[PDB]
Every structure is written in C-alpha cells, then in structure tokens.
Tab-separated table of C-alpha atoms (C1' of nucleotides) in Angstrom:
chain	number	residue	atom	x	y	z
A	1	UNK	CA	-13.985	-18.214	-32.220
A	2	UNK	CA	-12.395	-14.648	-30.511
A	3	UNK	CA	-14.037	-13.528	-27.625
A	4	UNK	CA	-16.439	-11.121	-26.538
A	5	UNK	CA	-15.592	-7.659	-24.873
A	6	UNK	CA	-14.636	-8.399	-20.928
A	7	UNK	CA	-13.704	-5.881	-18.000
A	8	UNK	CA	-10.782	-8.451	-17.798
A	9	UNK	CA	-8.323	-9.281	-20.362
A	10	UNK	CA	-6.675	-12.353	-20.480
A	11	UNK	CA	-2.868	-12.261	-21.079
A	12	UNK	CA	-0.771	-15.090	-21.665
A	13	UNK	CA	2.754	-15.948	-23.173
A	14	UNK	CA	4.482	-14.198	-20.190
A	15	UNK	CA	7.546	-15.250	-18.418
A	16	UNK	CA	7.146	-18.090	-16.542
A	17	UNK	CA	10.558	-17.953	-14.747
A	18	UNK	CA	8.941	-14.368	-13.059
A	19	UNK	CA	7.575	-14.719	-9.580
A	20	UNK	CA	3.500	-14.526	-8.945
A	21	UNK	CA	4.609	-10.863	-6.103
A	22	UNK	CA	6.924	-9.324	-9.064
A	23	UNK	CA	4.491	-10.078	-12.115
A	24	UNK	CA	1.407	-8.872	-10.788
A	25	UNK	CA	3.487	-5.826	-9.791
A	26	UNK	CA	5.039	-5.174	-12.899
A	27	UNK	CA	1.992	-5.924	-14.664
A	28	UNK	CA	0.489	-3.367	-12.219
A	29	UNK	CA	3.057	-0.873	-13.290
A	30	UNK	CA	2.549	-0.869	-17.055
A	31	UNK	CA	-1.662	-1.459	-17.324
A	32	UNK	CA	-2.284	1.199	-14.606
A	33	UNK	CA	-2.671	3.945	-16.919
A	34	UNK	CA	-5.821	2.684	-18.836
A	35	UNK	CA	-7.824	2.622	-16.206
A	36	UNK	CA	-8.394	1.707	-12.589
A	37	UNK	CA	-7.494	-1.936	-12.042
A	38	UNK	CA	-9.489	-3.987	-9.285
A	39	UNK	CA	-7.267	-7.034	-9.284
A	40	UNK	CA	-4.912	-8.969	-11.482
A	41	UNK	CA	-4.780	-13.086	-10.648
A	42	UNK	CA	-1.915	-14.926	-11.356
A	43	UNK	CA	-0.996	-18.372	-10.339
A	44	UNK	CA	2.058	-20.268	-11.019
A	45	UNK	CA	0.267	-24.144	-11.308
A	46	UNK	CA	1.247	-26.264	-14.113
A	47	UNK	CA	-2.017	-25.254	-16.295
A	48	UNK	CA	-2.341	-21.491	-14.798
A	49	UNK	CA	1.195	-20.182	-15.333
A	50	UNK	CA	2.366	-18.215	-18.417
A	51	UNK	CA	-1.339	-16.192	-17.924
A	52	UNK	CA	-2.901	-13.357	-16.115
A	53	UNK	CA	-6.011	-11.870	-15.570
A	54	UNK	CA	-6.331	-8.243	-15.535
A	55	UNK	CA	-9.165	-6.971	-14.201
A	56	UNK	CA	-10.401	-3.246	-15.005
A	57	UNK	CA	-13.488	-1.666	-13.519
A	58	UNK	CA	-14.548	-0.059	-16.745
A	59	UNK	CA	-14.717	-2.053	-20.158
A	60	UNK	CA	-12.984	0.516	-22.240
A	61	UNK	CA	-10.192	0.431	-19.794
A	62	UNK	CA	-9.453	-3.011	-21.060
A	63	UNK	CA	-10.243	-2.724	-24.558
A	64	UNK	CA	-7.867	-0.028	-24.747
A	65	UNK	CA	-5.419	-1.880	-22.508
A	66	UNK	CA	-5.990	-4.953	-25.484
A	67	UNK	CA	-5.055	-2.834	-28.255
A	68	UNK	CA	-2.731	-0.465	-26.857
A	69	UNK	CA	-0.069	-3.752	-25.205
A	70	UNK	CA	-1.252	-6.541	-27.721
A	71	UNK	CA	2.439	-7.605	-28.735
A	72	UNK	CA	4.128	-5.234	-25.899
A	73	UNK	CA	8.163	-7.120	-24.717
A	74	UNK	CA	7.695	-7.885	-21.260
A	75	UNK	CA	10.536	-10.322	-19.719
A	76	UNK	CA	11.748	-10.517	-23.138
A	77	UNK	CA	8.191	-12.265	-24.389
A	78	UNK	CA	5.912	-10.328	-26.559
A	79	UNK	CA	2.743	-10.316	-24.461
A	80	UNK	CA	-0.551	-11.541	-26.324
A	81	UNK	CA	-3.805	-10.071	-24.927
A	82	UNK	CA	-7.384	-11.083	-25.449
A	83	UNK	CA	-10.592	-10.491	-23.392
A	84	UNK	CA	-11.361	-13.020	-20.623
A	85	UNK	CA	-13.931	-15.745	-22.092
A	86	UNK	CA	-16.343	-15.027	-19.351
A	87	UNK	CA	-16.486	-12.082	-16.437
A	88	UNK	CA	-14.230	-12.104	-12.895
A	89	UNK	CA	-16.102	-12.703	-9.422
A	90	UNK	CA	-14.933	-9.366	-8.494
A	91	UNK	CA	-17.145	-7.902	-11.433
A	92	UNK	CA	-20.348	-10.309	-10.338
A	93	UNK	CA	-20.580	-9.257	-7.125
A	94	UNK	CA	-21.755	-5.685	-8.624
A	95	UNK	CA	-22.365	-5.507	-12.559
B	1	U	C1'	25.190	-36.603	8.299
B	2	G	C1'	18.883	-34.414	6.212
B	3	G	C1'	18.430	-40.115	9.452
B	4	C	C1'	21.986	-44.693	10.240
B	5	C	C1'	25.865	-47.801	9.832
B	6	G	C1'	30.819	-50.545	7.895
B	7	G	C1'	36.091	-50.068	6.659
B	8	C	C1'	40.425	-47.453	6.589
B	9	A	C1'	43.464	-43.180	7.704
B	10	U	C1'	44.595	-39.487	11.433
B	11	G	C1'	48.971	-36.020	17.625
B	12	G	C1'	46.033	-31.812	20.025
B	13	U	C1'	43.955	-26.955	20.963
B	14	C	C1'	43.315	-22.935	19.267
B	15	C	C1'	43.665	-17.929	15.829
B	16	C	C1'	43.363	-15.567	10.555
B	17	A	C1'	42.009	-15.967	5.505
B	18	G	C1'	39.483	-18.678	1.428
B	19	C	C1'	35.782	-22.126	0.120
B	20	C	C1'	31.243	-25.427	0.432
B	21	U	C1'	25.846	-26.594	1.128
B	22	C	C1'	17.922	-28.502	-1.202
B	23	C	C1'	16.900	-29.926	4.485
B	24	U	C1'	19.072	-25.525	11.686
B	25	C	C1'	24.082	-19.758	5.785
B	26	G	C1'	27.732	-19.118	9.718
B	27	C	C1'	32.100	-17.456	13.265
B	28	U	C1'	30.206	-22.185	20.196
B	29	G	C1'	28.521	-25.523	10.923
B	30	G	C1'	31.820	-27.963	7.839
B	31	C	C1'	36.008	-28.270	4.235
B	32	G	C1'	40.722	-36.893	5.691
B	33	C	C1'	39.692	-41.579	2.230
B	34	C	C1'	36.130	-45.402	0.781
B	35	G	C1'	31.248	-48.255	0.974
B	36	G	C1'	26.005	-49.470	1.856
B	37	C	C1'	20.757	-48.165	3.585
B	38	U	C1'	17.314	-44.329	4.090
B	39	G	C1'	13.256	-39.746	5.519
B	40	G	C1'	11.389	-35.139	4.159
B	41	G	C1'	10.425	-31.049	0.601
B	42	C	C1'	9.440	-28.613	-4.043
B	43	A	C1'	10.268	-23.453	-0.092
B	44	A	C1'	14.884	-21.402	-2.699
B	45	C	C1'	17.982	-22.746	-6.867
B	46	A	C1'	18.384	-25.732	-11.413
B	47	C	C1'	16.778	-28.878	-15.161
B	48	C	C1'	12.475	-31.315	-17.867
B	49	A	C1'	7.623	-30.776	-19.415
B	50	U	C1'	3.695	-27.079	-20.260
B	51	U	C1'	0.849	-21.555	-24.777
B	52	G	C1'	-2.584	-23.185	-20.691
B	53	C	C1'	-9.348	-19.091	-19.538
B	54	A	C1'	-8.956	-18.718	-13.944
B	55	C	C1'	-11.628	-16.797	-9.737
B	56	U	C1'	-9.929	-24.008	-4.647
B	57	C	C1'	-3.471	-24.090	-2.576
B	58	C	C1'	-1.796	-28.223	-5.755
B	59	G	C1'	3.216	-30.984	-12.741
B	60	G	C1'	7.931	-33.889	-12.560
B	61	U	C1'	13.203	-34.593	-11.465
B	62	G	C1'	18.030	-32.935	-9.402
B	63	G	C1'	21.822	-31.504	-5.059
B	64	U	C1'	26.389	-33.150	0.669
B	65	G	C1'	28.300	-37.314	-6.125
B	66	A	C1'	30.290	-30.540	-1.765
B	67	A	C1'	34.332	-27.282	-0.004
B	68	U	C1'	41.761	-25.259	1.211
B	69	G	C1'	45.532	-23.154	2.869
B	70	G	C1'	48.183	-20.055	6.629
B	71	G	C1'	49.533	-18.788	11.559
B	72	A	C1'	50.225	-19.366	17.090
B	73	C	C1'	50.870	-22.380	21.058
RNA sequence: UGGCCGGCAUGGUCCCAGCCUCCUCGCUGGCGCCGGCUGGGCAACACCAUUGCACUCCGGUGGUGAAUGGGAC
C-alpha cells in the first residue's frame, strides 16, 4: 500500500558505512535545490540506519525531490525515495 | 600490561632511524622468550547481522595472539 504525499520523504538503501555528520551533509548538499529543507534525521541504531528523513517545508519540494533522486548513486547505492508514512514533529508544531 | 601474577633469558646509559597499538599516538610509550587469570568500551577501526518509517541515546563480536635495526659512550 504506497504512501500518501508527505513534506518529508523517506529515503532508505543508503550507505550504512557513512557517518550520521557526513550523510546528513551530503544529503544536505544534493536535496537543497528543491526546496528549503527544515531538518533531515538520521540515526545509525540497528533498525534506523540505512534511512533518512528529509524534511521540506513545502510539499512540492519533496514530491519533486521523490521523483527527481528516486534511483540517484549516492555512496555507490542507488537511493530509493518514498514519502514519510505519517508527518515530522517539526511540521506539527505549525501545519 | 587495559588490571595481576608464574617461569625463563638478559651488562648499562644514552643518541638517530624504522615499526607497533581498541583502552593515557608519542619523543621523560613500547618494539627479549613462554604461561595463566581478568576489567572496561563499542568511541575509532574491522568483521557479522540488518532494507529497517523515525521524531527517546541504545544490535553483536574482534584487537597487545603487536612492533627492528644503527650509532655513541
């Protein structure tokens, strides 16, 4: 069952062997240009790592950013994208 | 030596270079042989496992079972 549309997208299938500082920053460096980004989460635990959670202030910021990057190499891994199953904090505490 | 001990071997103090290491990365650490007991930590590194939807930091195991020569007194 896919997912609704989200101001976050959910990646996963990234490079686990990449430090939580350098991944958020990378993955800063290439979703930047859809859109304003609020925050991107990332933990390394044992059922968190692999993932991310980009979140844009504006929905079309991360629809684009879903169709634009679905498949994109990143650390050698083709990055699959999908919207987050439900909204970020960040996005509660206004919208 | 991360903490502790048994045996053996071994003239000393320095000075230069090379090398080693999970547990005070280096010049007021170490770089003979052999044996047993043991604490901490996944922080770095490595290996194993993991494709996982969060907004609570949080899987497991491994290592020192290491590393040479030269010079001056």
């Amino acid at each position: 069952p896919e997912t609704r549309p989200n101001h976050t997208i959910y990646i996963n299938n990234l490079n686990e062997k990449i430090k939580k500082d350098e991944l958020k920053k990378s993955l800063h460096a290439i979703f930047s240009r859809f859109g304003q980004i609020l925050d991107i989460l990332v933990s390394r635990s044992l059922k968190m790592r692999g993932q991310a959670f980009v979140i844009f202030k504006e929905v079309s910021s991360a629809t684009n950013a879903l169709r634009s990057m679905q498949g994109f190499p990143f650390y050698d891994k083709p990055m699959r994208i999908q919207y987050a199953k439900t909204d970020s904090d960040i996005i509660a505490k206004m919208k």
